[PDB]
Amino acid sequence: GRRPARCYRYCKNKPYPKSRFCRGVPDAKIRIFDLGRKKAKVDEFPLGGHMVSDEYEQLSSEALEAARICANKYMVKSCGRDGFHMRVRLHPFHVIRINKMLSCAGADRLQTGMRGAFGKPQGTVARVHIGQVIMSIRTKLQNEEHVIEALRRAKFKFPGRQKIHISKKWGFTKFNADEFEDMVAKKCLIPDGCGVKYVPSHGPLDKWRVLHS
Amino acid sequence: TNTKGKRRGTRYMFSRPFRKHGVVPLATYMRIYKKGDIVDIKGMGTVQKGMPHKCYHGKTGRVYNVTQHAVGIVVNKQVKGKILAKRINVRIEHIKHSKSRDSFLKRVKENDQKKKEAKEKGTWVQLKRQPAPPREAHFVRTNGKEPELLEPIPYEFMA
Amino acid sequence: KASGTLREYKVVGRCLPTPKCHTPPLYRMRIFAPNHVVAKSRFWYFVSQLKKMKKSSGEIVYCGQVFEKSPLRVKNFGIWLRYDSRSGTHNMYREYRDLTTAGAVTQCYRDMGARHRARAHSIQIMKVEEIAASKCRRPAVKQFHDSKIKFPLPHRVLRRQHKPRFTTKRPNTFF
Amino acid sequence: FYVPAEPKLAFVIRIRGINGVSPKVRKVLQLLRLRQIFNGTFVKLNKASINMLRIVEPYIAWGYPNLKSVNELIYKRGYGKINKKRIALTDNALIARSLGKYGIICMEDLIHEIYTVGKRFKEANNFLWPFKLSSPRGGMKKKTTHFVEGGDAGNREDQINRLIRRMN
RNA sequence: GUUUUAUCCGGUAAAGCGAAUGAUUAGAGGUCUUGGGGCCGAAACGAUCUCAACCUAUUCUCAAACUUUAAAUGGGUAAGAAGCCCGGCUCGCUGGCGUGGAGCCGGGCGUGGAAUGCGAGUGCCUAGUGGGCCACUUUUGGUAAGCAGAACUGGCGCUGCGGGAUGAACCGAACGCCGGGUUAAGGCGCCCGAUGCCGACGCUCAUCAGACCCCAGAAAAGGUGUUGGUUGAUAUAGACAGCAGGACGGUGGCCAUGGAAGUCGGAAUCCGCUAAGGAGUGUGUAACAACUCACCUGCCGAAUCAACUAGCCCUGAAAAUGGAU
RNA sequence: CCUCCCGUGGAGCAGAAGGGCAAAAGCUCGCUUGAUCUUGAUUUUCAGUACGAAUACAGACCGUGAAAGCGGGGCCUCACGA
RNA sequence: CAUAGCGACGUCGCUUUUUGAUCCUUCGAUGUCGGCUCUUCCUAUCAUUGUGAAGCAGAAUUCACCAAGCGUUGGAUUGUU
RNA sequence: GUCUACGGCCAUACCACCCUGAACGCGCCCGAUCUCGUCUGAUCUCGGAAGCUAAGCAGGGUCGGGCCUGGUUAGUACUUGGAUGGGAGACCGCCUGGGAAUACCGGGUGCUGUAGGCUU
Ligand SMILES: [Mg+2]
Ligand SMILES: [Mg+2]
Ligand SMILES: [Mg+2]
Ligand SMILES: [Mg+2]
Ligand SMILES: [Mg+2]
Ligand SMILES: [Mg+2]
Ligand SMILES: [Mg+2]
Ligand SMILES: [Mg+2]
Ligand SMILES: [Mg+2]
Ligand SMILES: [Mg+2]
Ligand SMILES: [Mg+2]
Ligand SMILES: [Mg+2]
Ligand SMILES: [Mg+2]
Ligand SMILES: [Mg+2]
Ligand SMILES: [Mg+2]
Ligand SMILES: [Mg+2]
Ligand SMILES: [Mg+2]
Ligand SMILES: [Mg+2]
Ligand SMILES: [Mg+2]
Ligand SMILES: [Mg+2]
Ligand SMILES: [Mg+2]
Ligand SMILES: [Mg+2]
Ligand SMILES: [Mg+2]
Ligand SMILES: [Mg+2]
Ligand SMILES: [Mg+2]
Ligand SMILES: [Mg+2]
Q: DSSP alpha helices (H): ranges in B5-148?
A: 27-30, 99-121
Q: CA C143 from chain center: how many Å?
A: 22
Distance between the alpha carbon (CA) of A142 and the C1' atom of E295, Å: 21
Strand locations in chain B, DSSP E?
38-41, 60-66, 70-79, 82-91, 95-97, 138-139, 148-149
Q: Phi/psi zone of residue B9: left (φ > 0), alpha (ψ -120 to 50 degrees), beta? A: left
Measuring CA to CA, which residue among D36, D39, D33 is closest to residue D131?
Answer: D39
Q: Phi and psi (nearest 5°) for B79?
A: -125, 110
- Minimal CA separation from C85 to chain A, in Å: 13
Tell me whether D46 touches chain B (CB under 8 Å): yes
Instruction: Report the alpha-carbon distance of residue B71 to residue B100 in Å, rounded.
Output: 20
- Minimal CA separation from B155 to chain A, in Å: 14
Measuring CA to CA, which residue among C22, C15, C102 is closest to residue C50?
Answer: C15
| CA-angle at B76, arms to B70 and B81, nearest 5° | 150
Based on its alpha-carbon atoms, the radius of gyration of chain B, rounded to whole angstroms, reads: 26
Judged by CB atoms closer than 8 Å, whether chains meet at B152 and C46 is answered as yes
Tell me whether B158 touches chain C (CB under 8 Å): no
Q: Which long-range contacts (CB under 8 A, 24 or more apart) does B101-106 make?
A: B101/B37, B101/B38
Q: What is the DSSP string of A3-43?
A: PPGGGS-S--SPP--SSSSS--PPPPS----EEE-TT--TT
DSSP C17: P
| CA-angle at C151, arms to C146 and C153, nearest 5° | 150
Instruction: Report the alpha-carbon distance of residue C78 to residue D100 in Å, rounded.
Output: 65
Q: How was this structure determined?
A: cryo-EM
Instruction: Report the alpha-carbon distance of residue A61 to residue C19 in Å, rounded.
Output: 56
- CA terminus-to-terminus distance, chain D: 36
Q: For B152, which of C12, C26, C124 is closest by C-beta distance?
A: C124
Q: Are strands D154-155 and D60-63 parallel, antiparallel or unpaired?
A: parallel
Q: Report the residue numbers after which chain A has a gap, meaning the C atom sits over 2.5 angstroms from the next written residue's N, or none.
A: none
Distance between the alpha carbon (CA) of A39 and the C1' atom of E46, Å: 35
Measuring CA to CA, which residue among D87, D77, D84 is closest to residue D114?
Answer: D77
Count the alpha carbons within 13 Å of B135 in the hemisphere toward its beta carbon.
Answer: 15
Tell me whether C86 touches chain A (CB under 8 Å): no
Instruction: Report the alpha-carbon distance of residue C98 to residue C141 in Å, rounded.
Output: 10
Angle between helices D47-55 and D23-31 (to 10 degrees): 140
DSSP C90: E
Tell me whether B23 touches chain C (CB under 8 Å): no
C48 Cα: distance to centroid of ligand 13 (angstroms): 45
Measuring CA to CA, which residue among B150, B140, B155 is closest to residue C42?
Answer: B150
Contacts with B, A 134-173, CB within 8 Å: 163, 165, 167
Judged by CB atoms closer than 8 Å, whether chains meet at B159 and A167 is answered as yes
Confirm if C35 and D157 have CB atoms less than 8 A apart.
no
Compute the Cα dihedral for C118, C92, C9, C69 and give only its sign.
negative
- Minimal CA separation from B146 to chain D, in Å: 12
Number of Cβ atoms within 10 Å of the Cβ of D12: 26
Compute the Cα dihedral for A126, A129, A130, A133 and give only its sign.
negative
Helix/strand/coil percentages in chain C, nearest 5: 20, 35, 45
Resolution in A: 2.5
Instruction: Report the alpha-carbon distance of residue C88 to residue A91 in Å, rounded.
Output: 26
Which residues, other chains included, contact C115 with Cβ-Cβ below 8 Å and sequence gap of 6+? none
Tell me whether C121 touches chain B (CB under 8 Å): no
Instruction: Report the alpha-carbon distance of residue C114 to residue B44 in Å, rounded.
Output: 65
Judged by CB atoms closer than 8 Å, whether chains meet at D1 and B131 is answered as no
Compute the Cα dihedral for D82, D86, D91, D95 and give only its sign.
positive
Measuring CA to CA, which residue among A178, A211, A213, A181 is closest to residue A196?
Answer: A181
Instruction: Report the alpha-carbon distance of residue D80 to residue D90 in Å, rounded.
Output: 10
Instruction: Report the alpha-carbon distance of residue A45 to residue C111 in Å, rounded.
Output: 45
Per DSSP, what are the bridge partners of residue C125? C81
Based on its alpha-carbon atoms, the radius of gyration of chain D, rounded to whole angstroms, reads: 16
Confirm if B63 and B37 have CB atoms less than 8 A apart.
yes
A11 Cα: distance to centroid of ligand 11 (angstroms): 39
C partners (3+ CB pairs within 8 A) are A, B, D
- CA terminus-to-terminus distance, chain C: 43
Which residues, other chains included, contact D5 with Cβ-Cβ below 8 Å and sequence gap of 6+? B134, B135, B136, B137
Instruction: Report the alpha-carbon distance of residue C155 to residue C174 in Å, rounded.
Output: 6
C77 Cα: distance to centroid of ligand 26 (angstroms): 33
Per DSSP, what are the bridge partners of residue A58? A127
Burial label, C25 (beta-carbon count in 10 A; 0-12, 13-18, 19+): exposed
Distance between the alpha carbon (CA) of B108 and the C1' atom of E113, Å: 8
Which residues, other chains included, contact D123 with Cβ-Cβ below 8 Å and sequence gap of 6+? D99, D102
